[PDB]
Design a binder for this molecule. Structure first.
Ligand SMILES: Nc1ncnc2c1ncn2[C@@H]1O[C@H](COP(=O)(O)OP(=O)(O)O)[C@@H](O)[C@H]1O
Ligand SMILES: Nc1ncnc2c1ncn2[C@@H]1O[C@H](COP(=O)(O)OP(=O)(O)O)[C@@H](O)[C@H]1O
Ligand SMILES: Nc1ncnc2c1ncn2[C@@H]1O[C@H](COP(=O)(O)OP(=O)(O)O)[C@@H](O)[C@H]1O
Ligand code: BEF
Ligand code: BEF
Ligand code: BEF
Ligand SMILES: [Mg+2]
Ligand SMILES: [Mg+2]
Ligand SMILES: [Mg+2]
Ligand SMILES: [Zn+2]
Ligand SMILES: [Zn+2]
Ligand SMILES: [Zn+2]
Ligand SMILES: [Zn+2]
Lengths: 370, 337, 369, 363, 248, 126
């Protein structure tokens, strides 16, 4: 029961060696080139979607600047200042919650303390995270230091939406952008991490979590630790699926194939056996809508189906060949409306059943006879 | 007004709603749902008087004591009211915050600690979520009360903590009799007042003693010229008195009565203007009539919901759209989504 | 750089820092206004406190080999460390380049330093008059002239005291609304005529630092800079320009009614009348009759105060309103038991001199009550 | 003495152990296994609709986490820390209602607090509830303390709806979607409670109460209190039926059969009678929707009759036979949109009248 | 209005009450989220009146004998009530008739009447807060410690004035750093019989405890570099203090 | 390459001449003729959008109102009076940024200054 274990894979497996930063080849290449060539700008703005590594890359660069001397391209061995940086001991590393310093007086206070360089290091680095929420006057205040700061002070600003903050700050020194990680890279990272912790993993679970993670390793790691908690130190397909709540996509596929084939009895069979599976009706409808969008997608390019869809790619091809686009759009409209009024249906199962039955009755080819 | 006004048909409900507190099993919260001017305010007031009274008499409050003497002076240190300021309309987080921070202290007079929210729909959702903890788990001897015209518009959470007591409007004949005893005029006007107000006798009283009734008459007369001539624009002056919701409601009630007259129904709401009803049925096509009724209800909703919207622009566009619809060859909208 | 070294006993270090605290701190608009300047000259340490118009210099005597040099240190933190240390412990002070090391007993401290940011000429006078006013002279002069001078007043020149040296005597004057103060101190030296205005805050700083009624003082007064050498220490202030009214035109206004008698009795009567004086119009009524004074007050509280005093008088029956606070300051700063009072009119200035000597005179323009 | 020894069922029957929680095995299993195996995450975000147990699961998690008997999936419940956390008087479990503490002053206060040592328990845990309405400044200041806190700091977030969370806030905490409680689970828990408290009931009223409360056990208990307040302290079918004002299938089918044959006068007379009896209009609309659903089922496959009641199933069979599927679909859609617009209607009765009269459009 | 009967009745010297309030007043919460903290706990048992104050990072307990047999009772008096109680009682008059009821407190001091309403709720127990197995002990003169901490607090951080204690056999050491990257360090000669230990306190609460302790010799008890400290009179056990340390 | 690193274009190209001010000729002509004729007001306010010229026109007005050549609409830009402002340090010119100065104490401090005569120029400019 009791323990002293755990490290929270999010809190454990952050990059600290430039070799764990997955993806974002552009920014790592630029940073390595600049550090090796000694060209360092006075302001860094990492942008991108959530859960990608902007904070981790900022820590990476900050410790690459001040690490027992030596202008390295990040690799630095037996670097004390680096180890306090990764240990939470601030060494010329000032993280600032910009929301606590929105007013221009607070940023003026930030400005006037720019001269305190020699503190067991060469550069003092400022991480004004979520920088897009500064006030205009605060932006102007920090702009004066932005254009011509002291040599020893480097600005590293992190934000999610570069559109919000003013153009002049946007243009000042640099603006790097981190793309969302692909589900393939998420799969690699989750597999590697769970390998490091002597915990088995079914590749179906890895793919499920990778797709369920919106291209963000922090979402992927939170979900993966949830999966580990749900099981007993082992991730398995059925446990992962019951955790997400997503039903058999093949159950939904059989349901939509039955809807196309206009056999209401089989539709009822599928819906009641899915009810016995204890799945959310909203989830069933949204998964069917995803399948309908996918079957419309294959109408324009065969590459619509992801790698996982190799399991059911043949049925996708058959439905795409069989059903004309107008019928796909009719079904999509019917089911999208049905989902829109699902909250007002007398029961979620009742509403989903009625929506399917309506798609059956308004069948373009073979409707329900009067 | 002064201690508001008790209403004769309210006596049963209160009795039931005091039994649950006499036995001590009273749920701390209570979300009384009642129409505007129905009389829920007197019910909440009488309840709180019984609750904070140090000596609760059988079905009465005290008879004689200081504990509710401070209540009559409206200066009890436990009794708190949450109403938006006379100059404003939204109940802020600050007032609920003050009340809930002062609740954690003991009861000053050794009795209960009663709170009251004058009108729950006016509660800003931030204030509702600040009051959520206080409603879900209040301290010992703490009670609550709330008043709503409708509960469905309230936050999904606030009603879930509370009991949704309901005030049924009095039977139609009893309400008509009471209003006849109070206000003297033809029963057609009284039936129109009750059916328009969804059965709230207090709202019928407000309609009569308020100027709106005469203004309502004005509207009728204006329509008496508009529909025979297809000239609705001249209704503008009738429909702009900062009462655009209520006047649009009267117009929609008239159109409802006309559509009822098509599918001939025994009972209609407007019984003081049967000739107007017949004329409205005669000139207007049922599909056009339903489209116009839908537009009237839509505009009334748009005016009631969003404050700061320009009444004149909305009503002018409505009248122009109606005039357009009375022209043959137009495509009418249908509710959807 | 140059480095500095000090081994300074605490007690002989506190009084200079404590004194120079006037033009130090107090909402420092700049990172350099709120700091104290240290410099080493031969065998002395100069502590300079600046607020861009008042410069206060303290000379700490050095008794040990001390490294020369100058620096700028946060005045408040230096004062706090020098005060909190145990009594009698010599403090060892060193300049570690950008830092300021200070050690004492079993305690160590470091300070942030500013190399050179407040080192201009800082002062330039004219010195029309260089009277060696001794301590006791300006002591009583300033305590008898300060009163409660102009605050928020549009007339800037009324803020500072007017000094006028002529012959062997210096006359100090001050105008504020109704009240006016003047003292004619007989310096006794053959001195040139000179007129000058000094800022009020400079006056209060000089009076506060003054203390110690024994040592003659050197006062060098120009047209833009005034310097006062109070024994060990030095103070300098700016100078307000002219437009000041002439005391020779506001003091002598041909008084015709003369009165005398006790000052402390008038003090007690004024205090007791201030209880029932008009709280909106500060001032009571004075009925003047032959060898008799009556003081009356009627506050908005509908409470009437009346007192009778034996004050000599040989003029005509009079009724003069007056501010109790102004005349009470007059009595308190007169430091005398008997006063003389000259009346002119109910709308013309009323003089009040010391019955002990002509050296102290005052004016209060009467009130209309 | 007069201190109201009675407590409402919605709070008296709050879960006190992981074995007392109704449903949500998908989260209880994960939480208990994480407690036991040695994997505990520093920020938990329980999200779900009203009355499903986010606060209760969080409080049980707090009970377990800082119990003095190690860190077990089963809190003892007899120790000190269990007792105070149950009572809510524990220093290290701090309840923050995010509606109030959204100004930067309070967030700065919280960030100042997190830097210190605990007082009595192993972990100092902030139960922040209704987090989804912290001002953007509050969330941006809270990011740092939600990401990498000290060793003895864990956060428990409770939200009514995850949508309003800044997605970055979602990503740093461990999401637990509390599923809405099924009608069977609610009815069984109600049966267990009412049998435990020696209160007479019958299963029918339990099913009605479960149906009325859309998957919220607290709502079920609220309706239980309303149903026992009226009706001499007992639960009965007539009592709950009157409390809800629900109507039998006969009247709703009369409405749908009159409206499907365009009998407008009959429809309006039925509405007049229903108003005279004073029914709940939303109940009328849900009954009409249910009948139309059953008719559609019968049309699809004759096997799925109306057999739950099967009292006037002759009428349902006839109506299915005599009406094309398209017309029933239009009737359902019209009634449903009308149901969506009851709050926006100036009056409930008139809103239902609008909806029915619009359903009367087809010939 | 009819007055409330009292279940706790006693009478106190002004010196005793003043000492208790001065001992615990700086140790109670201001507007803190935990509602039951913003106040002072007045426990009574046997012939002893005990006073407890906490804000989640501090604890002051002050116990003084009364000589009057008293029931075991607990009560919390909020911020304003105790502040104006301390303001109200200042003279040397013996009458301090203190009455504790179920919902309000009243102290009669001659011609002045105290009135306030109690914070409903149960205070956390202090004995569970004081460490039970203090295996490290320190001793020093009270004034030496107080002056030392006041001197070292000069150059600390502004809003939160953190200081670091290095406690070892050789001597005691305290250091302080500020956002201005300024260093302060100092040494004290306390008698220790143990190994090195590093702890992090806030100089504000330590200075307050030393200032209001008002004794000659002081003893510190310690267990761990994260656990709570127990500072007490080295010559008496009528008042104990706890300062939950600071993370670095 | 490293151009402007010494002097940012904004600072480097601050208009020292009316011919250096492109645009705002409607204001430039008015200022020039007001200076030449003598219709000088006690206060002048300019409204613009950030980098529009307000500080530039104000400093040019300071040059033209207190130049060694006199009150001239065409400042020389080389005299001691002109060069003192051009460098930035003019004793009788007090330039204030109100963003950091919203208090009443400092405003009153300048209020006292409004009274004395200019030290070097003909008029005191605030
Ligand atoms: N590029 C990456 N390489 C390795 N780990 C990553 C990466 N991006 C995110 N992570 C994982 O997510 C955790 C938190 O990442 P973080 O950088 O905070 O994302 P964010 O951009 O949203 O702040 C890290 O501890 C790490 O395990
Ligand atoms: N999973 C559950 N098991 C048992 N009772 C529950 C459950 N969920 C809710 N309840 C009931 O609802 C009441 C309130 O539950 P609570 O946990 O506060 O819901 P919330 O998530 O909305 O805060 C509890 O007192 C309990 O009676
Ligand atoms: N009308 C203008 N003519 C020439 N340069 C201008 C003009 N307006 C702005 N500038 C340029 O911008 C710089 C700063 O101008 P400034 O007049 O200080 O703007 P502000 O109105 O914001 O105080 C000047 O040095 C000049 O280069
Ligand atoms: F900073 Be990330 F969005 F978790
Ligand atoms: F009522 Be729960 F906290 F959503
Ligand atoms: F940007 Be300007 F100087 F107003
Ligand atoms: Mg982040
Ligand atoms: Mg909750
Ligand atoms: Mg400018
Ligand atoms: Zn390194
Ligand atoms: Zn009473
Ligand atoms: Zn336990
Ligand atoms: Zn020139």
């Amino acid at each position: 029961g009791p323990h002293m274990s755990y490290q929270v894979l999010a809190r454990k497996w952050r990059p600290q060696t430039f070799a764990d930063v997955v993806g974002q080849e552009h920014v790592l290449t630029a940073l390595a080139n600049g550090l090796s060539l000694g060209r360092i700008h006075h302001a860094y703005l990492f942008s991108g979607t959530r859960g990608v590594g902007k904070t981790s890359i900022a820590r990476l660069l900050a410790k690459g600047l001040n690490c027992e001397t030596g202008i390295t391209a990040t690799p630095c061995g037996v670097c004390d200042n680096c180890r306090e940086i990764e240990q939470g001991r601030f060494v010329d590393l000032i993280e600032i919650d910009a929301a606590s310093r929105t007013k221009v007086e607070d940023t003026r206070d930030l400005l006037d303390n720019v001269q305190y360089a020699p503190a067991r290091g060469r550069f003092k680095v400022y991480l004004i995270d979520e920088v897009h929420m500064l006030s205009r006057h605060s932006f102007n205040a920090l702009l004066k230091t932005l254009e011509e700061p002291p040599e020893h002070v480097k600005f590293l600003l992190a934000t999610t939406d570069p559109q919000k903050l003013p153009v002049t700050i946007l243009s000042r020194c640099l603006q790097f952008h981190l793309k969302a990680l692909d589900v393939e890279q998420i799969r690699h990272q989750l597999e590697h991490i769970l390998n490091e912790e002597h915990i088995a993993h079914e590749p179906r679970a890895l793919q499920l979590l990778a797709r369920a993670a919106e291209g963000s390793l922090r979402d992927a790691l939170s979900l993966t630790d949830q999966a580990i908690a749900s099981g007993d130190g082992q991730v398995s397909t059925q446990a992962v699926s019951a955790m997400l709540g997503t039903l058999d996509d093949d159950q939904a596929l059989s349901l939509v194939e039955a809807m196309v084939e206009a056999n209401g009895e089989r539709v009822m069979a599928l819906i009641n056996e899915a009810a016995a599976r204890g799945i959310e009706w909203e989830a069933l409808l949204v998964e069917m809508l995803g399948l309908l969008h996918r079957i419309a997608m294959v109408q324009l390019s065969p590459a619509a189906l992801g790698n996982d869809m190799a399991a059911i790619e043949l049925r996708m091809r058959e439905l795409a060949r069989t059903i004309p686009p107008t019928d796909i759009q009719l079904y999509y409209q019917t089911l999208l409306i049905g989902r829109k009024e699902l909250p007002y249906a007398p029961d979620r199962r009742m509403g989903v059943e009625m929506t399917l039955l309506r798609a059956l009755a308004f069948h373009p080819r073979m409707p329900l006879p009067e | 007004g002064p201690h508001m006004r008790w209403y004769p048909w309210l006596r049963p409900d209160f009795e039931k709603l005091v039994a649950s507190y006499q036995a001590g099993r009273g749920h701390h919260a209570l979300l009384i749902q009642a129409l505007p001017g129905m009389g829920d305010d007197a019910l909440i007031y009488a309840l709180s008087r019984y609750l904070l009274c140090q000596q609760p008499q059988g079905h009465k409050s005290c008879g004689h004591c200081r504990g509710c003497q401070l209540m009559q002076a409206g200066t009890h240190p436990d009794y708190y009211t949450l109403a938006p300021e006379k100059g404003k309309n939204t109940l802020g987080v600050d007032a609920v915050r003050e009340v809930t921070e002062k609740l954690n202290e003991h009861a000053r007079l050794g009795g209960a600690k009663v709170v009251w929210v004058t009108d729950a729909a006016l509660l800003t959702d931030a204030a509702a979520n600040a009051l959520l903890k206080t409603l879900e788990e209040p301290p010992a001897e703490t009670w609550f009360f709330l008043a709503t015209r409708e509960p469905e518009r309230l936050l999904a959470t606030l009603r879930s903590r509370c009991r949704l007591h309901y005030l049924a409007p009095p039977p139609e004949q009893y309400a008509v009799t009471w209003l006849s005893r109070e206000v003297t005029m033809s029963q057609d006007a009284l039936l129109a007042a009750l059916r328009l107000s969804a059965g709230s006798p207090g709202a019928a009283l407000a309609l009569f003693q308020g100027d709106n009734w005469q203004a309502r008459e004005t509207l009728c007369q204006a329509l008496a010229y508009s529909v025979p001539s297809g000239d609705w624009y001249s209704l503008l002056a009738a429909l702009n008195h900062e009462q655009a919701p209520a006047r649009l409601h009267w117009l929609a009630t008239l159109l409802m009565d006309a559509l009822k007259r098509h599918h001939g129904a025994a009972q209609v709401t407007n019984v003081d203007v049967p000739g107007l009803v017949a004329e409205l049925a005669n000139h207007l096509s049922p599909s056009r009539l339903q489209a116009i009724l839908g537009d009237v209800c839509h505009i009334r909703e748009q005016l009631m919901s969003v404050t700061g919207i320009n009444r004149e622009l909305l009503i002018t566009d409505l009248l122009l759209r109606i005039e357009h619809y009375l022209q043959p060859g137009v495509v009418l909208p249908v509710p959807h989504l | 750089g140059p480095h500095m070294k000090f081994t300074v006993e605490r007690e002989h270090l506190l009084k200079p820092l404590q004194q120079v605290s006037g033009p130090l701190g107090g909402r420092p608009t700049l990172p350099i206004l709120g700091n104290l300047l240290l410099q080493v000259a031969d065998g002395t340490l100069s502590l300079t406190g600046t607020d861009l118009e008042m410069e206060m210099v303290a000379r700490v005597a050095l008794v040990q080999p001390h490294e020369p040099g100058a620096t700028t240190v946060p005045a408040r933190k230096f004062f706090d460390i020098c005060r909190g240390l145990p009594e009698g412990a010599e403090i060892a002070v060193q300049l570690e380049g950008e830092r300021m090391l200070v050690r004492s007993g079993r305690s160590r401290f470091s300070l942030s330093t500013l190399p050179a940011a407040d080192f201009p000429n800082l002062d330039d006078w004219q010195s029309e008059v260089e009277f060696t006013l001794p301590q006791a002279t300006m002591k009583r002069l300033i305590e008898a002239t300060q009163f409660s001078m102009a605050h928020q007043d549009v007339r800037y020149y009324l803020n500072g005291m007017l000094f006028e040296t002529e012959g062997e005597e210096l006359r100090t004057v001050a105008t504020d609304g109704h009240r006016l103060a003047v003292c004619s101190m007989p310096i006794g030296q053959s001195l040139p005529s000179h007129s000058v205005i000094v800022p009020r805050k400079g006056v209060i700083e000089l009076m506060r630092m003054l203390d110690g009624g024994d040592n003659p003082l050197r006062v060098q007064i120009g047209s833009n800079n005034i310097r006062a050498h109070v024994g060990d220490f030095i103070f300098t202030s700016k100078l307000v320009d002219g437009r000041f009214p002439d005391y020779r035109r506001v003091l002598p206004k041909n008084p015709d009614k003369h009165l005398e008698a006790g000052c402390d009795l008038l003090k007690q009567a004024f205090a007791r009348a201030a209880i029932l004086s008009n709280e909106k119009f500060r001032g009571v009524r004075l009925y003047v009759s032959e060898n008799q004074l009556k003081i009356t007050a009627n506050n908005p509280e509908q409470e009437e105060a009346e007192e009778i005093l034996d004050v000599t008088y040989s003029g005509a029956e009079m009724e003069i309103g007056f501010n109790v606070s102004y005349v009470l300051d007059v009595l308190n700063a007169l430091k005398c038991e008997n006063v003389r009072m000259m009346l002119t009119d109910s709308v013309s200035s009323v003089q009040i001199e010391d019955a002990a000597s002509q050296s102290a005179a005052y004016v209060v323009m009467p009130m209309r009550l």
